[PDB]
Design a protein around this nucleic acid. Structure first.
Lengths: 157, 105, 50, 492
RNA sequence: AUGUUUCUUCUUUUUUUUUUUUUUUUAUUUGGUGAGAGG
RNA sequence: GGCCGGGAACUCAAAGGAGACUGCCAGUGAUAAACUGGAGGAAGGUGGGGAUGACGUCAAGUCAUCAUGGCCCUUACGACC
RNA sequence: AGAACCUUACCUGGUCUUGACAUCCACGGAAGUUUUCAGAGAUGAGAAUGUGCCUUCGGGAACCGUGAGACAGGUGCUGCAU
């Protein structure tokens, strides 16, 4: 139902007088496949507890995005801290043609047709934050119609 | 309140009733509730700024008596007015009590 | 039971586990008791009816 | 002997967590009862046990009373005070009596009274400590299966009962089976089964969800309502105050695992979980799941809701034998009428036509004006008679004089209708006029009014022959009533 | 007051895998012999 | 010569309990923690001493206590004097 | 927390190899004991005596040796595999 999805684990560290202690961080993502998607970071001293704590905050972090039929509404930028994702709707683009960490977050969100490419530092946690704000500001024509023009028809013909 | 206030150690029984009354005021009228509240009536936005940030993490519509120094963005039903005079607070507390008595029909 | 061994408390003797029971007789015949004999081996205390 | 009483009191006090005093009071009562049985006469007896030695003195008790009804057990206050001036009403006068030897007979009586005191102390305190269990899902072992009930053993000499109505329709228990159920009532049948356990009532469903869903036990999710057809289907309505939690998703669990655990414990009962809404119409839409609702019409006065569904969904909305609509109605508290969109439109057209016919007939208005009143939402003569004048003045084409005239006509129509029915039967007009004649019961007044005798004058004009066919009216009683009516009408 | 220096050479990395029950033995008073009697 | 009778208080042996807690007074301090002093008490501020060694450090020590993965010898690196 | 031999793992020399220590196989002899020579000792050659336990006694195994291959042995190496 929730269709959870892991992206990348990592081995981070920090040192003390005794030595250095590692842990694990594991960015994951969840999504209903019909417009709800949420990620969550999570970190712990062991990978089973790392990925579970990741999902548990990803359940509460879900956002709604308004799309049409497995693809986006319009072209949209996505900038967040050294990660410029570009997203083009590509009406029946025959699969989600995107890179890693976008292929995850677009799939569980439910789109199936977008063309996308990330410009800049392809860092996984910063790029899944880049698509999210790029998707949540992307707007349906309904929201566009009821702020501007006030006809659902003529705003797109 | 009845029972083990003497049974084993009198000095350590004074420890628990030293533990009690500090917990009595910090967890005051919350122990009668159980679970999360539905709304939240604040009398100073600046001073209690943790809770407004805390309540806006969840879905709780809050009610703040705001003073001119604070920022009225996290509060939904913003109420402007003084909040450092005692006679001012008994207006808002007297109004929110008598109205919610009418709302509990 | 504790109360059976408490015969010593209110009274004395010993314990009450022993089956208290009075030799009662069977049925089939009525009658009227016309004559009672009591013979006593010598040395034994005669009771009040003897 | 002596020290043995103290050792027994200490052992029983420690093992049963019972006050030594309560055990002694009961042993005293047990010994008094055992003493009473050795005498051929009904005597009153007090026993007193010394709390240090275990020695006991037995009396011929004489309940000090004001009026003596039982001279063998009661003494007057005046006679009691002759022996001891300190005695009051309700005290006991004693008499040096030989204490019963503690044989295995008294021993058995003492054991029985101790066991009974433990049932009213140790077991009572255990039930008080298990305040949660008295309400939550207790677990018992089936001791006995009868035709009409199942006896459960809970341990510690506690017996519970499941009644036949409290069982699921397909459950078959055997002696030795473990059974869970909600303790829904504690009565006072200590000897036997004071505990009543249910598996059929809605509380069993609520408490199974409380155990299986941590978010309900933590008060994060609340169950607002539960409706149940035991062993077949249930509906539960859930609410949460935390916008981060889906209450339906939490109760279903990962792939339905939580709801399937509850369903399995209930013998494969189908459980629908619906979102509670504070809007009644939205809550009923949710309760009607899995049927899609097209429209709802709410009648607040009748506390009923008409639910329109697509013709393809009608059978799903009603459910097998009306089970879906009945469970939704029990869950909402509303009476739910499920029909097609076409049937709802036909019903509204028939109601509008009946309202138009009623208004045209009673208000002396044209059909065009009656249609405007129905389009503005007026359906009854009562609404038109009593609604605030402001709402009637908001209707296009109504002036203050026309609204006043319409209200006066509506009130006169309501008055006329009431009077007509009261004269036809015996509601008020014939229940006062025709019933004036002494002897007229309400039934006879309605029988008279069914013959057109509606007033005391109409009855004064009758012959005995005109009333002879009225069931329960003899010629003598008819003659008396006609004469009583004539005395009032013609000679008053 | 100021206090120089610490062979050489160098790592790997965490998403599919699993355990266990059987135990042990279980109304009560009244047999012969000899004599008599009923069918 | 407690050496003999005798004795059970005393020393001691050995069980089981009391007692020391900042409990009391004063003073200072935020009326808080406490701190300094006094009383009493055999013992006064964890009474004196011991056992007890957190996560880790050093791939510190030991494969010659033992056990152990490897590798090596097998008329021999084994076994006896 | 104790090296005259022993301990002792080291050294010279004398020795034996399925072995001083365990399980297994086939044979023969109760096991044990006393005593003599040769030998630095290990050992070698004996010489005498004992000849018990359960029985299917064609026995078997408490026990000593000889032959069989599995194997046994290692205070040999690596604490930076444990």
């Amino acid at each position: 139902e929730l269709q959870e999805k892991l992206i990348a684990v990592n081995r981070v560290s920090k040192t003390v007088k005794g030595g250095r202690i590692f842990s694990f961080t594991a960015l994951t993502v969840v999504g209903d496949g019909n417009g709800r998607v949420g990620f969550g970071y999570g970190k712990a001293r062991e990978v089973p507890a790392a990925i579970q704590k990741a999902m548990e905050k990803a359940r509460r972090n879900m956002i709604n995005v308004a799309l049409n039929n497995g693809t986006l509404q319009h072209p949209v930028k996505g900038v967040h801290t050294g990660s410029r994702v570009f997203m083009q709707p590509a009406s029946e683009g025959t699969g989600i043609i995107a890179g890693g960490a976008m292929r995850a977050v677009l799939e569980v969100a439910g789109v199936h047709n977008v063309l996308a490419k990330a410009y800049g530092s392809t860092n996984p946690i910063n790029v899944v934050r880049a698509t999210i704000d790029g998707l949540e500001n992307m707007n349906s024509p309904e929201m566009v119609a009821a702020k501007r023009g006030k006809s659902v028809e003529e705003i797109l013909g | 309140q009845d029972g083990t206030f003497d049974k084993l150690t009198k000095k350590e029984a004074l420890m628990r009733t030293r533990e009690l009354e500090k917990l009595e005021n910090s967890l005051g009228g919350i122990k009668d509730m159980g679970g999360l509240p539905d709304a939240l009536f604040v009398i100073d936005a600046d001073h209690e700024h943790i809770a407004i940030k805390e309540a806006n993490n969840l879905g709780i519509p809050v009610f703040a008596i705001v003073d001119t120094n604070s920022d009225p963005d996290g509060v939904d039903f913003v109420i402007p007015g003084n909040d450092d005079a005692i006679r001012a607070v008994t207006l808002y507390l007297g109004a929110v009590a008598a109205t919610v008595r009418e709302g509990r029909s | 039971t504790p109360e059976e061994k408490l015969l010593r408390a209110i009274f004395g003797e010993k314990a009450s586990d022993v089956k208290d029971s009075s030799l009662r007789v069977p049925n089939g015949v009525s009658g009227t008791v016309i004559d009672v004999q009591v013979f006593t081996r010598d040395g034994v205390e005669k009771d009040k009816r003897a | 002997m002596n020290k043995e009483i103290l050792a027994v009191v200490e052992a029983v006090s420690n093992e049963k967590a019972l006050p030594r005093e309560k055990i002694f009071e009961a042993l005293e009562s047990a010994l008094a009862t055992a003493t009473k049985k050795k005498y051929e006469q009904e005597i009153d007896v007090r026993v007193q046990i010394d709390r240090k030695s275990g020695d006991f003195d037995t009396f011929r008790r004489w309940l000090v009373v004001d009026e003596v009804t039982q001279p063998t057990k009661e003494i007057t206050l005046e006679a009691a005070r002759y022996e001891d001036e300190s005695l009051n009403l309700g005290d006991y006068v004693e008499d040096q009596i030989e204490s019963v030897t503690f044989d295995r007979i008294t021993t058995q009586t003492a054991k029985q009274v101790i066991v009974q005191k433990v049932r009213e102390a140790e077991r009572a305190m255990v039930v008080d400590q298990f305040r949660e269990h008295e309400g939550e899902i207790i677990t018992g072992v089936v001791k006995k299966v009868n035709r009409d009930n199942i006896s459960l053993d809970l341990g510690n000499n506690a017996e519970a009962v499941i009644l036949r109505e409290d069982m699921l329709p397909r459950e078959n228990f055997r002696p030795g089976d473990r059974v869970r159920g909600v303790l829904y009532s504690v009565r006072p049948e200590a000897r036997g089964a004071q505990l009543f356990v249910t598996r059929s009532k809605p509380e069993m469903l609520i408490e199974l969800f409380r155990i299986e869903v941590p978010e309900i036990g933590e008060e994060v999710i609340e169950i607002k309502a539960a409706a149940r057809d035991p062993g077949s289907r249930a509906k539960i309505a859930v609410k949460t105050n935390d916008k981060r939690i889906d209450p339906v998703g939490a109760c279903v669990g990962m792939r339905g695992a939580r709801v399937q655990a509850v369903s399995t414990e209930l013998g494969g009962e189908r459980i629908d979980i619906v979102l509670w809404d504070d809007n009644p119409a939205q809550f009923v839409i949710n309760a009607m799941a899995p049927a899609d609702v097209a429209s709802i019409v709410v009648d607040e006065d009748k506390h009923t809701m008409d639910i329109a569904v697509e013709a393809g969904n009608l059978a799903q909305a009603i459910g097998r034998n009306g089970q879906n609509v009945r469970l939704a109605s029990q869950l909402s508290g509303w009476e739910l009428n499920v029909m097609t969109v076409d049937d709802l439109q036909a019903k509204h057209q028939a109601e509008a036509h009946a309202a138009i016919d009623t208004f045209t007939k009673y208000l002396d208005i044209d059909e065009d004006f009656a249609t405007v009143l129905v389009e503005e939402g007026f359906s009854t003569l009562e609404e038109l008679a009593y609604v605030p004048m402001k709402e009637l003045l908001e209707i296009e084409g109504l002036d203050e004089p026309t609204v006043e005239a319409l209200r006066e006509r509506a009130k006169n129509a309501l008055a006329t209708i009431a009077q007509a029915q009261e004269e036809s039967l015996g509601d008020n007009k014939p229940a006062d006029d025709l019933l004036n004649l002494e002897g007229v019961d309400r039934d006879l007044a309605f029988k008279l009014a069914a013959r057109g005798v509606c007033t005391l004058e109409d009855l004064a004009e009758q012959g005995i022959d005109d009333l002879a066919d009225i069931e329960g009216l003899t010629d003598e009683k008819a003659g008396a009533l006609i004469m009583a009516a004539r005395n009032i009408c013609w000679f008053g």
